[PDB]
Symmetry: D2
Subunit: 329 residues, 4 copies
């Protein structure tokens, strides 16, 4: 039923030279991010900071969509313009986070699972009425923990169950099984684990009859572990990540937007840039949170007189990644 709509949303978000701005922090997380610049965590300050982001001048050139938190999806500018309505003209599609976060998985050794399927069909339905057109759900696997068979299983199984519920409510599911950076593992181990979790996630989605034309992928890049002494330059990170994707994603999938996951901003930019010297079977873009935002918070410093310079910092980094999306950096 939503088939035409889902394919349309996915194509808009998977546009050339455009990526996603992730802004779906919890009220508490946005609070910890606001006190880094000494700003009190009120609903007005969160609303003001979110308005600052969505009204940045030329965002729509480099940002095709924005992942909002539930509170922000209903908020408006001080002018009175609904936030989703401001995004619509910069041709930025409104998305929202729908998972309920990570919880200890029983009978593992410190591994996590992502909850949120209870009531998810109703919640996604209301988010669709409110203007949201794609969803986001993040689950993780830990190489230092294996991952175990059952932890990798629930990450992939939960995602495929979520992808079907999201599409049936009119929301393009973003499928994020994040292979975490934790550990000393080399790039070959992360390639192995990425190939396994994607093969497993895609198998369950096929089982659930998810329409691949109407989904987007948010993977981590194939990189060595955070504590691995053997590092990897942008050329290697590009070669290892592209072969992984070519081995696991069918061409029916329109877009693939990487997470930063603890890289630089420049590393996140060079690595993406090194992947777009050639054509790709799908749109290989970006979907960053801190990588696009940390420049803005410390430039803004809560002072309304620094708003324009902060919104300018947002565009400098959003354009730098759009330059990378086309290899023009």
């Amino acid at each position: 039923k939503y088939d035409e709509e889902l394919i349309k949303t996915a194509g808009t978000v998977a546009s050339k030279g455009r990526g996603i701005l992730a802004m779906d922090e919890s009220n508490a997380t946005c609070g910890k991010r606001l006190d880094s610049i000494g700003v009190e965590n009120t609903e007005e300050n969160r609303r003001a900071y979110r308005e600052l982001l969505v009204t940045a001048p030329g965002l729509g050139q480099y940002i095709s969509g924005a992942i909002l938190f539930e509170e922000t999806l209903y908020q408006s500018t001080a002018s009175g313009k609904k936030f989703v309505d401001v995004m619509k003209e910069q041709n930025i599609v409104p998305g929202i986070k729908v998972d309920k976060g990570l919880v200890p998985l029983s009978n593992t050794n410190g591994e996590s699972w992502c909850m949120g399927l209870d009531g998810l069909d109703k919640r996604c339905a209301e988010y669709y009425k409110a203007g949201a057109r794609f969803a986001k759900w993040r689950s993780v696997v830990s190489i230092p923990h294996g991952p175990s068979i059952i932890a990798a299983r629930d990450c992939a199984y939960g995602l495929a169950r979520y992808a079907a519920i999201a599409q049936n409510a009119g929301l393009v599911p973003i499928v994020e099984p994040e292979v975490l950076l934790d550990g000393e593992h080399d790039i070959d181990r992360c390639l192995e684990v990425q190939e396994a979790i994607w093969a497993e996630t895609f198998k369950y989605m096929a089982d659930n009859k998810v329409m691949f034309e109407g989904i987007l992928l948010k993977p981590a890049m194939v990189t060595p572990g955070a504590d691995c002494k053997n590092k990897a330059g942008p050329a290697k990170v590009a070669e290892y990540t592209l072969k992984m994707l070519r081995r696991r994603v069918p061409p029916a999938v329109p877009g693939i937007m990487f997470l930063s996951g603890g890289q630089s901003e420049l590393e996140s930019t060079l690595n993406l840039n090194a992947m777009n010297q050639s054509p790709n079977p799908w749109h290989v873009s970006f979907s960053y949170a801190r990588a696009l935002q940390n420049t803005v918070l410390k430039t803004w410093q809560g002072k309304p007189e620094n708003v324009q310079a902060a919104q300018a910092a947002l565009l400098k980094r959003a354009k730098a990644n759009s330059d990378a999306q086309q290899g023009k950096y």
Copy 2:
């Protein structure tokens, strides 16, 4: 952390000549029961009924556990002593339904899945503090619908997830993948579907490292469909059901407490009785709702003068199924 208590609780519930009184009706559903006897669905009427059940004078000889609704777990008698404190003085284990019900499963043709995992760890911890010691979670499969691959998968997967979450919270999980009566299927088709869903549920439970010595099962018996041509008496249903169990339940599982699911009060007792003519590798007993308490509602009729006769009817139907648990049922 709770391993030995789970084993101790499972052995008290799956004890000789005892079974479970399923009392976990919704506020809405318990209202339907009360309307069937012309009693208005108020909180005091529901509380009065639940007090009538758990305060029946001799229930501890035949009932080993009672599945409570979340509201009932915290209620007390009119005299002011707690239900769970009533049950323990009769060596009845308080249990709690912890699932959040059935919901259409996306991209199937009318099939449902059972939700409730979100926050389940915290709810079971609170139910444990309140004195509950076992839990219940009901998922279903429909033979008219197949069931489909992904529907049976989620029935087994969700139950195995729930079983691990409950054991880590200290609640013995009752595992209920009910194969529904609906359809025209014969008893061979029901046995085939039962064997598949139990093989899938036990594989996932093994994967999740569930401790089989601390679980209880609540299957449907192996019967022909509700709308099936040929029918099966107590001896054939006992034969088909025991075959299913012998082929799929490992001996470490201490107890198997069946649901009635749409048979008469008498049929439920006779089927259970026919399964206990010879010893079994596990305790084969009952977990009955509409069977055990149907006669209590009609004897009560909401009238305080009928309280004692309604409790006597409960003990009589409880004593029948306890006799059936030992293959000693005398229907005279």
Copy 3:
């Protein structure tokens, strides 16, 4: 060790404007072919007929590989030089059928499974010594039987086992889970069963660490059932087939060479040509047996005087399908 050469071979076989000629008939099956044109099934008439195919003068222009039977891989021309050397001179890669055929699967109601894993590692190692560079293994699923869970499972499980064995022996595996035409099923049901069996096959192949850059696919096209009323033009088989391939095959797979399987010598060309109107993420071509061989059989009639006209009949229908690989066919 064979990683680099497997990638080269898969690219050579997946060249553009080229497909594979399947000539892997058993001695008994090929004898059935010669009896239909009144020819006696001896080893020399089989060798003579296979020489007629391998020695067609232009062949190596529309044909990149040829699937051989185990006997033909070792026999030479009348001159005395090995058939495998003719193929290399024509830039055609020698292939080899490596399965041991279909057998009833236990506890199914009439479903089959494909034998061959026993000794396969040693069998492929010697075929590589004999100059073969790719392999073929055909398993089936039957919509009229479901297919059942365990029947589809073994089809995908065996193919993924074989693919890993063939690669470690140096042969590019051709992966052929054939969804049979049998039954009255429509195109949507064939679409559903095709998507399932390929999801299962690729999952197992991923578990087995099969290198997707060095494999080839031989699927059945997405069509209604042989006994189904609603037909399908080249336009809609093309869009049903390509959407299923795009929903299941990862871009790393170099080539997809289809089987004709009882369509028509005409229809096989129209369908393939319709799938090459636009660029594809992989080389979508043809792997045909009778659609290239049958008019060769009936023109040769076993008489040596018609060798030239029968070899010409081979090339004429080869180019018809090669032009279909380019979307440029009359």
Copy 4:
């Protein structure tokens, strides 16, 4: 024609109280090594004479219910001319046959094996049935030092379950042997975990394949520490761990469980089995030994015809000891 009733009868005959299986299915190469150990030439006649010695031991049938034969021995006769199958029929011993084709490196694993044999297995078992065989054997393995890997464990479970359905359809009761190897330093807990997983997997695939559990036999390794583990395990602990594993994974429909020795002394093999039979079990827990029954026979025979009766006495002494251990009455 359907063998369901004969399969059940065979399985119950082979899994009979006080009896176990003599495994004597060594290949010509392997039995040659055995004959060399006592310094005897590996001729076809010496293999036939050693096999005659074992099968013809007087009264062996009181302790041995079945004998796994190699393909060659299944068709051989005594020197006087009586077929070995007829000797075993007079001895009340069921003939069985090894049907797998040995271990082979599994592709893309780091040094792991799989067991081949499915090709032609249906015809082979059909011919073995006509020759008198009534049960079959298939040995697959998993390495703990290698994990085992997911695909190595999968093929072991998957091939066994496929072989079990083929065998039953041909009239042979399948002995299901996924051996967890002794290799490594792993402790008994790691063995337990790997045993539990491979049996959960093997039983799932078999349930999928509609294998009839009433007509199969199991041949597991015991649950013991690895060969190089520094923490050991006496008979009581081996029994506790092994029976827990079986209770948690083997459905009661399975009639018999016949352990391999796989690297234990004769005495510890007997004491381990004896410790598992101090109380009743839901299935017959017995033995399926090769070297633990044969090594003293070869060492006593020495190839010399004058030592035949002393070698047969040696076989009977060991078979009786394990038959006693099966009843728990070895020490007493």
